[PDB]
């Protein structure tokens, strides 16, 4: 299968999840505070007439990050919920080949909510599982 994913970075590390679960992408501006909210969330924004929660991806994966550097909110779309992810730069749509996709889950510490790792001669594009990431926020 030829998978189409959205490529984007955090802290000099490439990441990506499918285009199937994308609403659009925007640049950060003031995020409305919600009182007594979970620590891995920034707040809420109004996007296309809907109230989208703005999650901080790196606090879900447990990876190192620098908060000021981030400025791109990637709005996702699942059947359960629609959620924005604050990150660094974005590339766009990257067609990946099944031949170059490794499925090992013990390679790095966030490998269980990662669907795999795309091998390449540039920065290694890690394939996430949107599903298991939304499954984390609702517990």
């Amino acid at each position: 299968k030829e998978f189409e994913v959205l490529s984007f970075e955090i802290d000099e590390q490439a990441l990506a999840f499918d285009v199937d679960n994308i609403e659009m992408v925007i640049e950060k501006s003031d995020i409305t505070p919600v009182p007594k909210s979970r620590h891995f969330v920034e707040g809420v924004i109004n996007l296309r007439g809907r109230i989208i929660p703005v999650v901080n991806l790196a606090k879900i994966l447990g990876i190192s990050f620098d908060e000021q550097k981030m400025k791109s909110i990637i709005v996702a779309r699942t059947k359960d919920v629609e959620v924005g992810f604050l990150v660094d730069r974005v590339l766009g749509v990257l067609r990946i080949t099944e031949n170059q996709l490794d499925l090992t889950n013990v390679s790095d510490k966030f490998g269980k909510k990662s669907k795999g790792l795309v091998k390449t001669d540039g920065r290694l594009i890690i394939y996430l599982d949107i599903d298991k990431i939304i499954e984390e926020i609702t517990v």
Binding site: E4, V19, I22, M24, V25, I26, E27, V90, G92, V93
Partner: protein, 103 residues
């Protein structure tokens, strides 16, 4: 006559220190426009790719618009380095224009 000629140095020096900030505010504007056009083109490209078969012909054009937008973003980051060089050569000249005017 070296008086009148050095006063005409201050005409060139303050006209170039004004022309630095002039072009700088116009380049900050062509930067803003380019990176916003890049983001608008990228949104089109992603939403079109998501749309599948009928989205494809639009995604091709959208990515070609994005290519010219990121060539305009590159062009804006080069015309800025030279306007910031022109700035330095204009401001760093005013310490010499005030020395020839004093002497």
């Amino acid at each position: 006559m070296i008086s009148n000629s050095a006063k005409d140095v201050e005409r060139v020096v303050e006209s170039f220190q004004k022309g630095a900030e002039e072009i700088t505010s116009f380049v900050e504007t062509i930067n803003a426009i380019a990176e916003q056009t890049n983001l608008l083109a990228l949104n089109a490209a992603i939403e079109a790719a998501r749309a599948g078969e009928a989205g494809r012909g639009f995604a091709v054009v959208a990515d070609e618009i994005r290519k010219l937008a990121e060539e305009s973003q590159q062009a804006s980051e080069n015309v800025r380095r030279v306007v910031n060089e022109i700035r330095s050569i204009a401001e760093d000249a005013g310490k010499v224009s005030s020395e020839i005017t004093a002497r």
